[PDB]
């Protein structure tokens, strides 16, 4: 038959010829299984690589390569093919210690198509160290040659099509999969692998699932439908469009078939080795409407004089429905390239090579010598030659660089039903040339599949769950901002006091607004503060240009003279409230303004008590009226207040300091206001509390004796002036209780000010009438009446 | 010694073994292992001394002997593969042929029993698989093994990890610990636990917060993700190294204590119970076998140890040439090992089958042919074997049952002890009294997450799986939009929305209405004010020839009473739904009739003021001018000067409508509001001078007592005008804004009142009671 060629060199085979898809006394062969067509295709293709090996003059001349090609079945049978290769030609394979003198009856094998039989393969063929160069294993169990000394591979491990899925993940803008694995040891691993990988990429799982095992051609339990519809709920349920399937091509007929039930569309399916070329699942026709269904598998290299050679044409060593079963499948295999059948070319080829470099022949003679299997191994080790323009060289850990490709399912039979849309290179672990993919979306645009949706400008992240690419978009709080160089994770605030808006990520540094010269307000009260200031100065500069005189000798002279003096001393330093509060500023404010106004305050009031009390506390007390007009009494008494605004002013100095302050105004935080005392409410109300106290007293006074002469109608005139300060003072208090703001320094002076206008006018304006305009009330003779 | 020299024994049916005798290319020769191993040698002697006594029995296999090829097999499977082909050779011969089928293969051994290593296990089955030779197993424990697809001919001794990992999934359900992270070993047996234990959880409702890896001796990343997910128990199914390791880093990093549900690798062994701090690590409950010991094994080892020290036996007599040099000192650490009745037990349920297959009474065996190894099968499956008076059953898969103990660790001066507080028989039962907690008192670690999600909450999909829905409270003014969303939404700011509610409730106007108690009781206030206005007006109306009024005015008081009735009228429009009109004229209107009447008591303070505080030569003037058509024409100056300013003031201050959407809780708001203190306080600067002057005018006077204080009236007029307003501002900035425009009425209403019953008020009182003061040289 055709498994079989006589040569001086044989070549075993292992192709899976039969699958099993719907008593252990009665041993089931292969041939009553379902004809696989994979299985004839490659070994179509060995058989073609040896008959090229033969035809070739220049790569072995004058050494007919043969072969020996044994059904395997995908499990069950992968021991008796084993030992009648390693057998001699008597069917009895010898038992010693070593075997570097044993000859096997193959000298090379090209091994099972399916992981788990190409390790039971390679743990016996460790002994004699038989070279098996693997096909389409893609399990990464098989790198490592400690314990598969004698194994070597045509394909790329699983390690390269998870970078490839990775990097299609990255390119695309994806960080949010799916991942489903099957029950099997293949989509176990190969998800604890993409997750392994994938963590350290910046790309999370939102959950991973297993499918249960499950053949086609049989009945579903209810057990194994509720597992499914709940598969396919949490699927839909999640907001991840991602999904990726470790799963035999097999197991995944009910699958789709509930999720097409189920109605859910909008998956970007991305599809592993196993099932990424399977022609049955696009042939079902309906997963159309799925969306994508990207995958990975091995780049076609085209075969020349390959299709129409395969067009041409012991135990467990025949098959008699392939033929029938491959008709069919021609054209979609004819379109749709060669992916695995240059790999059984390639390692088939490599044999030759090493066969040829080992007997050291030189294009015309071959020295024919005998050939153990571990000096064949030690040559294909080191095998470096072109193939169809491609480089075929062994790594060290047993696999040769084939490029990857990433593929994409198209739904029309006029062109290849699987249409390659990238390519990956395994040897420099990078996936280019990335075509155009026809995409589920309206209009073309790459499906977002992003767990959450990118923060706004300025916007803190707090994170929501263990994944660490799920996140919540928080503005930051007024005051702060983000320095998305350092830490885009919490709000930095700005120092240097500048406060910032919501969503802004740039502080403005505070304007400091205060009171200035040039402003209208400040130029009113100025103005007001000059005229008050000329009117006492002409009102002094009568005074002294008039002594000797009743009305200045009556009332208080030098009293009068300090009072003005002092009054003088406060308009003048009313300018300094105005401009940039410094210490000095407000030290001197603050020792210098309280003190004028409340020394005035008090002789005013001491004044309207010795003007009309004393007479009646005469009668009472006349030891205390000795004891007062003995010595000086109002002097004594104005000297007692003074010295207790001394100590009260210095308390409330150590108490609310002297620092200046910056008091954020509740309008726009952007301004500042400063101000001399950072606890300003409580110093005016003692300053204003002590003030009315004396003033309550001395208005009570005047009142009593308002119609008594005394000293010109003095009582009247304070009695006027009392109550306008009392008014005046009433009036602060309640706009400072009502109001806070920018206005409060302006406000403060201008009652200052009109406080002081009205302790000079009402006081001394009438003495000024009297002496100018009344020059005979001024006389002597008129102090009898 | 020659202790090597019995690992062969000839007999009519020979058991082959595979042990780990020994420990540790590019020649095709097998590798050699020197290294001695105590566990190996102890196994091997254990199946020795079974043949031995399985001989020695008359009831079990009679008149036949039974040998062993005990064959040393290392960890690595190359140097195990040749005895297994020497065992399927056939006999007398070292060539092994290669047929279609086991039928026709002559093995030169009955049964095999099986590798310790469950990874060297693998490949011993399925090489043995082909020639069906009944193979059983001590210590090959992960389930795959159990597959009879691919392992027709291997039983085992051992419970399965399925049984195990189940009896730990019922223990994490029956105590609640429904939240819980699964972690396992690098190598295989770590990664079948989880995908065992990932089934299991599914099945039970279970949920696996994390399944990592812990690699052999990174861990760093597996236990950051662990503690990442508030969990509180762990399932490590790793072995020794892999959970050593673990718990080292743990040291190192002072890991918070947690309930470790161990695997029976790494529960009793001494390396992990020895580790310095391990008792800061919460409690250790794991599921340990519950299989006999052979009460004599120790005595059988130390006496065929002196007995092989004689050199009179041993001459009257390699596999194991490091076997030869060793002393009892070399092995006394292990005699104590549960799988001696392990490896005991399966060349006791080789032999019992075996007797089964031959048919055969206790008195003797019939002749027959030799049985093939593959007859075996048949009676191996279903093989009740009794073991030291214990029965065992090969299920149909070839797994054996027997119970488990769910140990506990204990600390007591640092030493670990195990306490049984559960047994496992197929359905767990606990005794969860006696368990002594790490807790800081003894509470049951809680680690469980929600199922599902009360009603009203945002539900988020937790878990390593779509496993637990982490049921989320959006703040007040949220709902959720739809069931699926994974944060609730707010409303539209419009609108108000209870803590916890599902969908949102929309906000309606609530202004100063006219049923609002504190509007009756302002109107009743308006409607006394009013009748006494009204009163007043009618005793000046009717009495104007008296000397009251034309001293007191005239026509003037009536106007100014006009105009208080029409403050009090004014008051009326403040209140109800805020028009744009109505609330733009509150202040103008309620200014106006208000200004007009202090005018007019302002004419009266400066009339009297004239005819006190100033010479009669400026009096004789100012008296005959300030009352007549010049003071009408003061008044309408005043009233048309108080028109510009409210004018001003409306087309440049804008008093505004406007609705505070998000001031009170439950409703909106539609608020009247004009310029903080600007607006009232430009519009009131003309009543503040006209009151002050009047009052600075009027408050101190020379009242003569034959005649009529006329200034009393208007002090205490402008003093309940100040008192009131002063009060009244406090009022504005302090009380509720709903009540503001009820402050405002309010305070209205106080000013009227006040100057009515100051200046009005006790004119009228004389005026009406006693008529006998009304003379003209009393007034005039
Ligand atoms: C070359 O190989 C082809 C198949 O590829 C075969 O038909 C042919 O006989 C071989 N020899 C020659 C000389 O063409
Ligand atoms: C079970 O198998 C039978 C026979 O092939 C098939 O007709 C049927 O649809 C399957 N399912 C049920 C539920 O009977
Ligand atoms: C769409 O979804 C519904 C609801 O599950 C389902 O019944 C229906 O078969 C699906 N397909 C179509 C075409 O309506
Ligand atoms: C191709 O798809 C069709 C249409 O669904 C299907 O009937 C057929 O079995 C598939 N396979 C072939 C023609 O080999
Ligand atoms: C293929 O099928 C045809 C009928 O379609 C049959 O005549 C022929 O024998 C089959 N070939 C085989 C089974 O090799
Ligand atoms: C194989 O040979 C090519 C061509 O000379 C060279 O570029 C390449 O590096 C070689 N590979 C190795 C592994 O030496
Ligand atoms: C796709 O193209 C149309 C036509 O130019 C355009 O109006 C439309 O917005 C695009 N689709 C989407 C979903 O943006
Ligand atoms: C923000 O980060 C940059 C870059 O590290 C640093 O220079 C700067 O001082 C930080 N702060 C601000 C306010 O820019
Ligand atoms: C078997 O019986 C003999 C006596 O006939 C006894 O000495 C020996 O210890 C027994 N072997 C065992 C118990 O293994
Ligand atoms: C084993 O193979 C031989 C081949 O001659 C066959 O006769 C025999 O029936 C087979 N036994 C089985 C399949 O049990
Ligand atoms: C335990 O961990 C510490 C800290 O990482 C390390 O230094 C030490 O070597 C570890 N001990 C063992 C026995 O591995
Ligand atoms: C574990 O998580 C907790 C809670 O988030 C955290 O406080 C702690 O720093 C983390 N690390 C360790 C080693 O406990
Ligand atoms: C017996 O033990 C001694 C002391 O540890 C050791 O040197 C010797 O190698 C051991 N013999 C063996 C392992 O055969
Ligand atoms: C049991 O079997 C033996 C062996 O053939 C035979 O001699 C004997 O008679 C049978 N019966 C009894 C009761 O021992
Ligand atoms: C062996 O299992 C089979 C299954 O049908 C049954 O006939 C038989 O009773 C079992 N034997 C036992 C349980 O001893
Ligand atoms: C397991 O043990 C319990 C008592 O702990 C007993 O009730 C039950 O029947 C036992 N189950 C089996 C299957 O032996």
Same mark, same amino acid.
């Given at each position: 038959?055709?498994?079989?060629?006589?040569?001086?060199?044989?070549?075993?085979?292992?192709?899976?010829?039969?699958?099993?898809?719907?008593?252990?006394?009665?041993?089931?062969?292969?041939?009553?299984?379902?004809?696989?067509?994979?299985?004839?295709?490659?070994?179509?293709?060995?058989?073609?690589?040896?008959?090229?090996?033969?035809?070739?003059?220049?790569?072995?001349?004058?050494?007919?390569?043969?072969?020996?090609?044994?059904?395997?079945?995908? &499990?069950?049978?992968?021991?008796?093919?084993?030992?009648?290769?390693?057998?001699?030609?008597?069917?009895?394979?010898?038992?010693?210690?070593?075997?570097?003198?044993?000859?096997?009856?193959? @000298?090379?094998?090209?091994?099972?198509?399916?992981?788990?039989?190409?390790?039971?393969?390679?743990?016996?063929?460790?002994?004699?160290?038989?070279?098996?160069?693997?096909?389409?294993?893609?399990?990464?169990?098989?790198?490592?040659?400690?314990?598969?000394?004698?194994?070597?591979?045509?394909?790329?491990?699983?390690?390269?099509?998870?970078?490839?899925?990775?990097?299609?993940?990255?390119?695309?803008?994806?960080?949010?999969?799916?991942?489903?694995?099957?029950?099997?040891?293949?989509?176990?691993?190969?998800?604890?692998?993409?997750?392994?990988?994938?963590?350290?990429?910046?790309?999370?799982?939102?959950?991973?699932?297993?499918?249960?095992?499950?053949?086609?051609?049989?009945?579903?339990?209810?057990?194994?439908?509720?597992?499914?519809?709940?598969?396919?709920?949490?699927?839909?349920?999640?907001?991840?469009?991602?999904?990726?399937?470790?799963?035999?091509?097999?197991?995944?007929?009910?699958?789709?078939?509930?999720?097409?039930?189920?109605?859910?569309?909008?998956?970007?399916?991305?599809?592993?080795?196993?099932?990424?070329?399977?022609?049955?699942?696009?042939?079902?026709?309906?997963?159309?409407?799925?969306?994508?269904?990207?995958?990975?598998?091995?780049?076609?290299?085209?075969?020349?004089?390959?299709?129409?050679?395969?067009?041409?044409?012991?135990?467990?060593?025949?098959?008699?429905?392939?033929?029938?079963?491959?008709?069919?499948?021609?054209?979609?295999?004819?379109?749709?390239?060669?992916?695995?059948?240059?790999? @059984?070319?390639?390692?088939?080829?490599?044999?030759?090579?090493?066969?040829?470099?080992?007997?050291?022949?030189?294009?015309?003679?071959?020295?024919?010598?005998?050939?153990?299997?571990?000096?064949?191994?030690?040559?294909?080790?080191?095998?470096?030659?072109?193939?169809?323009?491609?480089?075929?060289?062994?790594?060290?850990?047993?696999? @040769?660089?084939?490029?990857?490709?990433?593929?994409?399912?198209?739904?029309?039979?006029?062109?290849?039903?699987?249409?390659?849309?990238?390519?990956?290179?395994?040897?420099?672990?990078?996936?280019?040339?990335?075509?155009?993919?026809?995409?589920?979306?309206?209009?073309?645009?790459?499906?977002?599949?992003?767990?959450?949706?990118?923060?706004?400008?300025?916007?803190?992240?707090?994170?929501?769950?263990?994944?660490?690419?799920?996140?919540?978009?928080?503005?930051?709080?007024?005051?702060?901002?983000?320095?998305?160089?350092?830490?885009?994770?919490?709000?930095?605030?700005?120092?240097?006091?500048?406060?910032?808006?919501?969503?802004?990520?740039?502080?403005?540094?505070?304007?400091?607004?205060?009171?200035?010269?040039?402003?209208?307000?400040?130029?009113?009260?100025?103005?007001?503060?000059?005229?008050?200031?000329?009117?006492?100065?002409? &009102?002094?500069?009568?005074?002294?240009?008039?002594?000797?005189?009743?009305?200045?000798?009556?009332?208080?002279?030098?009293?009068?003279?300090?009072?003005?003096?002092?009054?003088?001393?406060?308009?003048?330093?009313?300018?300094?409230?105005?401009?940039?509060?410094?210490?000095?500023?407000?030290?001197?404010?603050?020792?210098?303004?309280?003190?004028?106004?409340?020394?005035?305050?008090?002789?005013?009031?001491?004044?309207?008590?010795?003007?009309?009390?004393?007479?009646?506390?005469?009668?009472?007390?006349?030891?205390?009226?000795?004891?007062?007009?003995?010595?000086?009494?109002?002097?004594?008494?104005?000297?007692?207040?003074?010295?207790?605004?001394?100590?009260?002013?210095?308390?409330?100095?150590?108490?609310?300091?002297?620092?200046?302050?910056?008091?954020?105004?509740?309008?726009?935080?952007?301004?500042?206001?400063?101000?001399?005392?950072?606890?300003?409410?409580?110093?005016?109300?003692?300053?204003?509390?002590?003030?009315?106290?004396?003033?309550?007293?001395?208005?009570?006074?005047?009142?009593?004796?308002?119609?008594?002469?005394?000293?010109?109608?003095?009582?009247?005139?304070?009695?006027?002036?009392?109550?306008?300060?009392?008014?005046?003072?009433?009036?602060?208090?309640?706009?400072?209780?009502?109001?806070?703001?920018?206005?409060?320094?302006?406000?403060?002076?201008?009652?200052?000010?009109?406080?002081?206008?009205?302790?000079?006018?009402?006081?001394?304006?009438?003495?000024?009438?009297?002496?100018?305009?009344?020059?005979?009330?001024?006389?002597?003779?008129?102090?009898?009446? | 010694?020659?202790?090597?020299?019995?690992?062969?024994?000839?007999?009519?049916?020979?058991?082959?073994?595979?042990?780990?005798?020994?420990?540790?290319?590019?020649?095709?020769?097998?590798?050699?292992?020197?290294?001695?191993?105590?566990?190996?040698?102890?196994?091997?002697?254990?199946?020795?001394?079974?043949?031995?006594?399985?001989?020695?029995?008359?009831?079990?296999?009679?008149?036949?002997?039974?040998?062993?090829?005990?064959?040393?097999?290392?960890?690595?499977?190359?140097?195990?593969?040749?005895?297994?082909?020497?065992?399927?050779?056939?006999?007398?011969?070292?060539?092994?042929?290669?047929?279609?089928?086991?039928?026709?293969?002559?093995?030169?051994?009955?049964?095999?029993?099986?590798?310790?290593?469950?990874?060297?296990?693998?490949?011993?089955?399925?090489?043995?698989?082909?020639?069906?030779?009944?193979?059983?197993?001590?210590?090959?424990?992960?389930?795959?093994?159990?597959?009879?697809?691919?392992?027709?001919?291997?039983?085992?001794?051992?419970?399965?990890?399925?049984?195990?990992?189940?009896?730990?999934?019922?223990?994490?359900?029956?105590?609640?610990?429904?939240?819980?992270?699964?972690?396992?070993?690098?190598?295989?047996?770590?990664?079948?636990?989880?995908?065992?234990?990932?089934?299991?959880?599914?099945?039970?409702?279970?949920?696996?917060?994390?399944?990592?890896?812990?690699?052999?001796?990174?861990?760093?990343?597996?236990?950051?993700?662990?503690?990442?997910?508030?969990?509180?128990?762990?399932?490590?199914?790793?072995?020794?190294?892999?959970?050593?390791?673990?718990?080292?880093?743990?040291?190192?990093?002072?890991?918070?204590?947690?309930?470790?549900?161990?695997?029976?690798?790494?529960?009793?062994?001494?390396?992990?119970?020895?580790?310095?701090?391990?008792?800061?690590?919460?409690?250790?409950?794991?599921?340990?076998?519950?299989?006999?010991?052979?009460?004599?094994?120790?005595?059988?080892?130390?006496?065929?140890?002196?007995?092989?020290?004689?050199?009179?036996?041993?001459?009257?007599?390699?596999?194991?040439?490091?076997?030869?040099?060793?002393?009892?000192?070399?092995?006394?650490?292990?005699?104590?090992?549960?799988?001696?009745?392990?490896?005991?037990?399966?060349?006791?349920?080789?032999?019992?089958?075996?007797?089964?297959?031959?048919?055969?009474?206790?008195?003797?065996?019939?002749?027959?042919?030799?049985?093939?190894?593959?007859?075996?099968?048949?009676?191996?499956?279903?093989?009740?074997?009794?073991?030291?008076?214990?029965?065992?059953?090969?299920?149909?898969?070839?797994?054996?049952?027997?119970?488990?103990?769910?140990?506990?660790?204990?600390?007591?001066?640092?030493?670990?002890?195990?306490?049984?507080?559960?047994?496992?028989?197929?359905?767990?039962?606990?005794?969860?009294?006696?368990?002594?907690?790490?807790?800081?008192?003894?509470?049951?670690?809680?680690?469980?997450?929600?199922?599902?999600?009360?009603?009203?909450? @945002?539900?988020?999909?937790?878990?390593?799986?779509?496993?637990?829905?982490?049921?989320?409270?959006?703040?007040?003014?949220?709902?959720?939009?739809?069931?699926?969303?994974?944060?609730?939404?707010?409303?539209?700011?419009?609108?108000?929305?209870?803590?916890?509610?599902?969908?949102?409730?929309?906000?309606?106007?609530?202004?100063?209405?006219?049923?609002?108690?504190?509007?009756?009781?302002?109107?009743?206030?308006?409607?006394?004010?009013?009748?006494?206005?009204?009163?007043?007006?009618?005793?000046?109306?009717?009495?104007?020839?008296?000397?009251?009024?034309?001293?007191?005015?005239?026509?003037?008081?009536?106007?100014?009473?006009?105009?208080?009735?029409?403050?009090?009228?004014?008051?009326?429009?403040?209140?109800?739904?805020?028009?744009?009109?109505?609330?733009?004229?509150?202040?103008?209107?309620?200014?106006?009739?208000?200004?007009?009447?202090?005018?007019?008591?302002?004419?009266?303070?400066?009339?009297?003021?004239?005819?006190?505080?100033?010479?009669?030569?400026?009096?004789?003037?100012?008296?005959?001018?300030?009352?007549?058509?010049?003071?009408?024409?003061?008044?309408?100056?005043?009233?048309?000067?108080?028109?510009?300013?409210?004018?001003?003031?409306?087309?440049?201050?804008?008093?505004?409508?406007?609705?505070?959407?998000?001031?009170?809780?439950?409703?909106?708001?539609?608020?009247?509001?004009?310029?903080?203190?600007?607006?009232?306080?430009?519009?009131?600067?003309?009543?503040?001078?006209?009151?002050?002057?009047?009052?600075?005018?009027?408050?101190?006077?020379?009242?003569?007592?034959?005649?009529?204080?006329?200034?009393?009236?208007?002090?205490?007029?402008?003093?309940?005008?100040?008192?009131?307003?002063?009060?009244?501002?406090?009022?504005?900035?302090?009380?509720?804004?709903?009540?503001?425009?009820?402050?405002?009425?309010?305070?209205?209403?106080?000013?009227?009142?006040?100057?009515?019953?100051?200046?009005?008020?006790?004119?009228?009182?004389?005026?009406?009671?006693?008529?006998?003061?009304?003379?003209?040289?009393?007034?005039?």
């Amino acid at each position: 038959s055709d498994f079989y060629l006589p040569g001086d060199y044989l070549l075993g085979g292992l192709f899976s010829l039969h699958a099993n898809m719907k008593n252990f006394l009665q041993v089931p062969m292969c041939k009553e299984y379902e004809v696989k067509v994979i299985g004839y295709n490659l070994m179509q293709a060995m058989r073609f690589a040896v008959e090229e090996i033969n035809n070739d003059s220049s790569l072995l001349p004058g050494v007919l390569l043969g072969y020996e090609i044994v059904d395997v079945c995908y &499990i069950s049978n992968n021991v008796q093919p084993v030992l009648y290769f390693l057998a001699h030609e008597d069917n009895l394979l010898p038992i010693q210690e070593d075997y570097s003198n044993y000859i096997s009856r193959v @000298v090379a094998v090209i091994g099972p198509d399916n992981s788990e039989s190409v390790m039971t393969v390679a743990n016996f063929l460790s002994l004699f160290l038989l070279p098996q160069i693997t096909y389409s294993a893609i399990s990464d169990e098989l790198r490592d040659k400690v314990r598969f000394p004698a194994l070597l591979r045509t394909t790329p491990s699983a390690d390269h099509h998870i970078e490839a899925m990775v990097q299609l993940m990255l390119h695309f803008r994806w960080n949010w999969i799916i991942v489903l694995v099957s029950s099997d040891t293949y989509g176990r691993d190969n998800g604890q692998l993409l997750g392994e990988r994938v963590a350290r990429r910046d790309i999370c799982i939102a959950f991973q699932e297993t499918l249960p095992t499950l053949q086609p051609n049989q009945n579903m339990t209810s057990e194994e439908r509720q597992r499914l519809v709940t598969i396919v709920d949490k699927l839909q349920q999640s907001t991840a469009r991602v999904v990726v399937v470790f799963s035999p091509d097999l197991t995944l007929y009910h699958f789709f078939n509930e999720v097409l039930r189920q109605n859910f569309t909008g998956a970007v399916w991305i599809a592993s080795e196993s099932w990424a070329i399977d022609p049955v699942l696009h042939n079902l026709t309906e997963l159309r409407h799925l969306g994508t269904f990207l995958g990975i598998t091995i780049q076609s290299v085209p075969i020349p004089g390959f299709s129409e050679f395969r067009e041409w044409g012991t135990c467990n060593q025949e098959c008699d429905n392939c033929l029938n079963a491959t008709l069919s499948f021609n054209t979609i295999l004819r379109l749709s390239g060669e992916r695995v059948v240059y790999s @059984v070319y390639s390692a088939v080829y490599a044999v030759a090579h090493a066969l040829h470099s080992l007997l050291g022949c030189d294009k015309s003679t071959c020295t024919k010598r005998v050939v153990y299997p571990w000096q064949l191994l030690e040559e294909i080790w080191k095998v470096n030659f072109t193939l169809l323009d491609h480089q075929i060289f062994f790594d060290p850990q047993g696999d @040769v660089a084939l490029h990857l490709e990433i593929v994409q399912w198209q739904w029309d039979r006029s062109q290849n039903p699987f249409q390659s849309v990238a390519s990956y290179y395994p040897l420099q672990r990078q996936l280019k040339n990335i075509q155009d993919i026809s995409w589920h979306t309206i209009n073309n645009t790459i499906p977002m599949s992003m767990c959450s949706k990118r923060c706004q400008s300025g916007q803190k992240k707090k994170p929501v769950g263990i994944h660490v690419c799920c996140f919540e978009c928080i503005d930051c709080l007024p005051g702060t901002f983000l320095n998305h160089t350092e830490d885009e994770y919490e709000c930095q605030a700005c120092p240097n006091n500048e406060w910032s808006y919501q969503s802004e990520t740039s502080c403005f540094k505070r304007q400091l607004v205060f009171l200035e010269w040039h402003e209208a307000p400040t130029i009113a009260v100025a103005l007001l503060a000059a005229l008050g200031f000329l009117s006492t100065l002409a &009102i002094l500069v009568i005074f002294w240009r008039h002594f000797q005189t009743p009305i200045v000798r009556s009332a208080g002279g030098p009293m009068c003279f300090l009072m003005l003096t002092l009054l003088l001393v406060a308009y003048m330093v009313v300018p300094v409230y105005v401009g940039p509060p410094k210490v000095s500023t407000c030290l001197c404010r603050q020792a210098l303004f309280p003190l004028c106004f409340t020394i005035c305050i008090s002789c005013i009031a001491v004044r309207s008590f010795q003007i009309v009390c004393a007479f009646k506390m005469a009668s009472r007390f006349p030891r205390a009226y000795s004891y007062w007009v003995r010595y000086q009494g109002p002097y004594v008494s104005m000297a007692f207040i003074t010295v207790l605004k001394m100590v009260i002013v210095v308390i409330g100095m150590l108490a609310t300091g002297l620092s200046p302050t910056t008091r954020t105004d509740p309008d726009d935080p952007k301004i500042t206001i400063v101000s001399c005392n950072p606890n300003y409410r409580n110093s005016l109300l003692f300053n204003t509390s002590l003030d009315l106290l004396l003033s309550v007293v001395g208005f009570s006074f005047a009142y009593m004796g308002k119609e008594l002469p005394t000293n010109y109608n003095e009582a009247k005139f304070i009695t006027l002036s009392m109550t306008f300060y009392f008014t005046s003072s009433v009036s602060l208090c309640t706009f400072m209780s009502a109001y806070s703001g920018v206005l409060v320094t302006i406000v403060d002076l201008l009652v200052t000010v009109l406080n002081l206008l009205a302790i000079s006018l009402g006081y001394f304006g009438p003495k000024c009438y009297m002496i100018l305009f009344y020059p005979e009330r001024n006389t002597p003779a008129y102090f009898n009446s | 010694l020659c202790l090597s020299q019995q690992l062969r024994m000839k007999g009519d049916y020979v058991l082959g073994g595979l042990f780990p005798l020994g420990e540790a290319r590019t020649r095709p020769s097998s590798p050699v292992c020197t290294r001695f191993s105590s566990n190996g040698l102890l196994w091997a002697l254990a199946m020795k001394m079974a043949v031995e006594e399985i001989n020695n029995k008359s009831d079990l296999l009679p008149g036949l002997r039974l040998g062993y090829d005990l064959f040393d097999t290392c960890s690595e499977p190359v140097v195990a593969m040749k005895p297994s082909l020497m065992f399927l050779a056939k006999a007398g011969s070292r060539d092994i042929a290669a047929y279609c089928n086991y039928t026709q293969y002559q093995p030169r051994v009955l049964a095999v029993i099986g590798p310790h290593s469950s990874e060297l296990a693998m490949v011993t089955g399925k090489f043995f698989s082909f020639f069906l030779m009944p193979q059983v197993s001590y210590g090959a424990s992960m389930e795959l093994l159990s597959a009879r697809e691919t392992f027709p001919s291997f039983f085992r001794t051992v419970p399965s990890d399925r049984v195990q990992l189940t009896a730990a999934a019922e223990l994490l359900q029956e105590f609640g610990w429904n939240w819980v992270a699964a972690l396992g070993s690098d190598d295989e047996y770590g990664r079948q636990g989880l995908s065992i234990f990932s089934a299991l959880a599914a099945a039970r409702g279970i949920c696996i917060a994390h399944e990592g890896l812990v690699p052999l001796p990174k861990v760093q990343d597996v236990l950051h993700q662990v503690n990442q997910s508030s969990v509180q128990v762990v399932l490590l199914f790793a072995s020794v190294h892999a959970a050593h390791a673990l718990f080292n880093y743990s040291i190192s990093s002072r890991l918070s204590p947690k309930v470790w549900v161990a695997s029976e690798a790494w529960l009793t062994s001494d390396l992990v119970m020895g580790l310095p701090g391990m008792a800061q690590m919460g409690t250790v409950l794991g599921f340990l076998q519950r299989g006999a010991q052979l009460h004599e094994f120790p005595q059988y080892v130390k006496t065929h140890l002196a007995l092989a020290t004689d050199p009179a036996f041993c001459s009257a007599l390699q596999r194991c040439p490091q076997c030869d040099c060793i002393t009892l000192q070399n092995v006394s650490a292990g005699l104590n090992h549960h799988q001696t009745f392990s490896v005991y037990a399966a060349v006791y349920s080789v032999a019992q089958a075996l007797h089964n297959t031959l048919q055969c009474n206790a008195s003797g065996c019939p002749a027959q042919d030799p049985v093939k190894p593959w007859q075996l099968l048949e009676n191996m499956y279903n093989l009740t074997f009794h073991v030291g008076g214990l029965p065992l059953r090969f299920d149909s898969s070839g797994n054996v049952d027997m119970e488990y103990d769910l140990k506990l660790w204990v600390w007591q001066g640092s030493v670990p002890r195990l306490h049984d507080v559960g047994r496992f028989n197929g359905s767990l039962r606990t005794e969860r009294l006696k368990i002594r907690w790490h807790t800081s008192d003894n509470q049951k670690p809680v680690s469980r997450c929600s199922r599902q999600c009360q009603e009203g909450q @945002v539900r988020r999909v937790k878990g390593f799986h779509s496993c637990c829905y982490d049921c989320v409270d959006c703040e007040a003014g949220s709902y959720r939009q739809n069931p699926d969303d994974i944060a609730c939404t707010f409303c539209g700011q419009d609108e108000w929305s209870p803590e916890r509610s599902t969908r949102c409730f929309r906000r309606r106007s609530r202004f100063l209405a006219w049923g609002e108690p504190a509007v009756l009781l302002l109107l009743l206030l308006l409607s006394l004010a009013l009748g006494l206005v009204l009163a007043a007006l009618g005793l000046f109306v009717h009495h104007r020839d008296s000397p009251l009024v034309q001293a007191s005015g005239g026509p003037l008081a009536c106007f100014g009473l006009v105009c208080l009735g029409l403050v009090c009228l004014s008051v009326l429009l403040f209140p109800g739904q805020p028009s744009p009109a109505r609330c733009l004229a509150q202040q103008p209107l309620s200014h106006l009739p208000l200004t007009g009447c202090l005018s007019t008591l302002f004419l009266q303070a400066a009339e009297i003021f004239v005819e006190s505080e100033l010479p009669l030569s400026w009096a004789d003037r100012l008296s005959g001018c300030l009352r007549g058509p010049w003071a009408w024409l003061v008044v309408l100056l005043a009233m048309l000067v108080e028109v510009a300013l409210c004018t001003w003031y409306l087309v440049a201050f804008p008093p505004e409508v406007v609705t505070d959407w998000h001031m009170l809780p439950t409703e909106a708001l539609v608020h009247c509001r004009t310029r903080s203190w600007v607006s009232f306080g430009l519009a009131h600067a003309t009543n503040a001078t006209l009151a002050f002057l009047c009052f600075l005018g009027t408050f101190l006077v020379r009242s003569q007592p034959g005649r009529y204080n006329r200034a009393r009236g208007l002090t205490f007029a402008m003093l309940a005008y100040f008192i009131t307003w002063v009060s009244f501002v406090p009022l504005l900035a302090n009380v509720q804004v709903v009540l503001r425009p009820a402050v405002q009425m309010g305070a209205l209403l106080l000013c009227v009142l006040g100057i009515l019953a100051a200046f009005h008020l006790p004119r009228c009182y004389l005026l009406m009671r006693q008529p006998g003061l009304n003379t003209p040289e009393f007034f005039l």
